[PDB]
């Protein structure tokens, strides 16, 4: 039998959290992997801001060209009914005015709460002292009460592949 699953490539950050690459980058990574299992993904070819980084598919690590520092990467899978299967992305605004995507597990949970018409979502069970309020469209830190704008966009869907069973 065949089952469909959404591919989300993730890289491990300094806070030990798996961060998603954007859908555009994930399609490029999958295309390189389909050509060669031990290839190198030059992320600068698809996103100028990621010009320092290369994904070494042989070792499954992202490395910075100028420093040699390595970060583990993973070809993760999510359900096709989840946000990345359609291209839905939830993002929060930093002090500088830039928008950052939530970690994929949190993005999926926010979208699931939003479509079930829940007024809010407490992320404390996931290990995050924050509340997402949908009527005001803002995130609030539970301990300090600081608010940040949030938004949803319809970007590109992440790659979707078949798993054989
Ligand atoms: N793919 C990526 N997308 C976005 N930010 C990234 C990516 N890879 C790493 N970063 C971030 O870049 C910053 C610097 O880490 P990087 O892996 O580039 O090099 P480094 O050698 O660890 O840097 P340094 O030791 O000088 O801080 C960190 O905040 C890290 O989370």
Residue numbers in the entry: 20 to 184
List sentences from the manuscript:
A highly conserved feature in all determined structures is the recognition and therefore the interactions involving the adenine ring of the ligands.
Unlike HUWE1, RNF146 and TRIP12 which each possess only one WWE domain, the DTX subfamily is characterized by a tandem-WWE arrangement. To visualize the interactions of ATP with the WWE domains, we solved the crystal structures of TRIP12 and DTX1 in complex with ATP. The DTX1-ATP structure has one ATP molecule in the WWE1 domain while WWE2 is unbound, a trend observed with our DTX1-ADP structures. A superposition of this structure with our ATP bound structures highlights the conservation of ATP binding to the proteins, with the exception of the terminal phosphate group, which adopts different conformations based on the residues in the interacting loop.
